[PDB]
Symmetry: C3
Subunit: 225 residues, 3 copies
């Protein structure tokens, strides 16, 4: 399958690799959800989500998006963001290559985000004639600076490295060969925080956003129906 | 008149030059509105707003501000911000010199803002004994970082170059001799985005702010009446 | 006592030094409140709050926090933040060493915040098993970038120098030997702003946050009761 789950002492590691660009279609979404179910079963201290050697994720499966299967894929994508944003343990994203559209929203759904200098991060929807869904806007608004939010969304601006960090698309820049190892190291460090206080505090930090993402998930049919 | 409009293939270019500091009094406001009407008529792909060689704009005509003519000038200034923030095409600001008070709010009313390193950007109201209007606060809050918003507003802090960029007062720094040419280049690039998706997305990115600016415009009489 | 107040022409200067780490227990809180009362009596043009040579403040007195005395200390700490955030004159923080937990929230309660490169600023609550109070979250949210807010709160991230400045924990970096002198200089400069416009504008910039801090103060018993 397109997802590999490993349980490594204090952490769970989930690696996406569909042999292509890790599109978040129904197959990948199911595989991710099952992997997180496995982490839940193991009661991991922290969880790493990684891409493959060429990308984090290129986004949704656009063949599907281009009514019901498209709606289900959209809902499932944003439900995954919600699941990771409300995860009771720290979540670290190993952004192992570019993160585009739903890949960028997924990247913005973890607590700590590690990327290499060259990796592009872009909500390219407007450049290809798609309006950004309300749930995705809320995910962006939660992390981007006010001015980077405007440009990322309305102008499909591409960020990388220092601009991605300043914008709020990522939290740490690492050399490409250590993005995954550094994400795993960070996750081990974060598993040392008090879990109860971490979860209580992250939810306070995200209360309005999580409500609005839920509303955005509920309203998908009223946009792509 | 103080405004020149030119239609250049995919873009409209509006250049302010009253031979002084481009104060946004009733004459300039009418001239700007008529120029945007002309862009609307031409159905331009993107719109550039530029200052003159010495300033973007020094702000309102303070002789007028220092009840009804002052109220009308205030309302018209913030209505222009609203018009540009809700413009259905990309708007690029060529910040060709300093942008002070209403000039800064106008600067913050476009999608992409280009300035040179040396150009000061400042809401100087508090330094000269004026409370910042509610509509202007909303314009600032939409673009500035949380901490830069506090300082810009409450302390009349002056920004330029790297500090203006980090703060969220501008989006791009160019050499002074290419601010206008770079703004026009960017506008041509943005005219290539899908217009419908751009507009739908920018409005989602600005929904609350636009409502609050409207409320701030409506409440002007209750402050300067 | 642990607080020294001096009145120096246009400014008041309040210096914390309990001979240790300036914990914000009931004794320090009372001493701070009495010092601000003295500044109010003098109608100072601006107010400086400083730590000692080793710290700004290490936070609350954790012996007390580890029900009623803990509730009173919590309420009083956040009431001090509210008092400084709504102060009608400019408030400058001389962050003379590290600022941890309530020390960081106090640091975030002034208009202009000066620190040296090496000084750590951290809400360490989650690292030591404490959930961050709602009033403290609102203080952080008012100043930190969206992404720095998430990390500061949920991951107990430590900031200093350029990262503290970019994050929105401080506004100015000075050499350690001039943090206090620079804070006093800045306060003199800010006393030159129009007081009435400063206060009217800062309150507009803080309206929602101040309401939410008040709600957070009121709800303390429902969390530590
Ligand atoms: Cl939607
Ligand atoms: Cl007003
Ligand atoms: Cl609380
Ligand atoms: K999308
Ligand atoms: K004004
Ligand atoms: K606390």
């Amino acid at each position: 399958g397109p997802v590999t789950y490993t349980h490594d002492d204090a952490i769970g590691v989930i690696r996406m690799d569909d042999g292509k660009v890790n599109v978040l279609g129904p197959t990948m979404q199911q595989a991710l959800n099952e992997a997180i179910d496995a982490a839940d079963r193991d009661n991991v201290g922290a969880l790493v989500i990684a891409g493959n050697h060429r990308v984090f994720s290129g986004g949704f499966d656009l063949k599907v998006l281009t009514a019901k299967p498209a709606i289900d894929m959209l809902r499932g994508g944003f439900e995954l963001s919600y699941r990771l944003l409300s995860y009771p343990k720290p979540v670290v994203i190993a952004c192992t290559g570019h993160a585009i559209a739903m890949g960028a929203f997924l990247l913005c759904s973890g607590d700590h985000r590690v990327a290499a200098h060259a990796y592009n991060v872009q909500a390219n929807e407007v450049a290809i004639g798609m309006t950004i869904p309300y749930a995705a806007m809320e995910v962006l608004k939660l992390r981007l600076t006010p001015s980077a939010y405007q440009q990322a969304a309305g102008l499909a601006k591409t960020f990388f490295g220092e601009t991605a960090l300043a914008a709020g698309f990522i939290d740490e820049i690492s050399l490409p060969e250590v993005v995954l190892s550094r994400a795993e190291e960070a996750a081990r460090e974060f598993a040392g925080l008090n879990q109860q206080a971490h979860n209580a505090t992250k939810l306070r930090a995200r209360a309005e956003a999580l409500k609005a993402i839920r509303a955005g998930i509920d309203g998908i049919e009223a946009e792509f129906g």
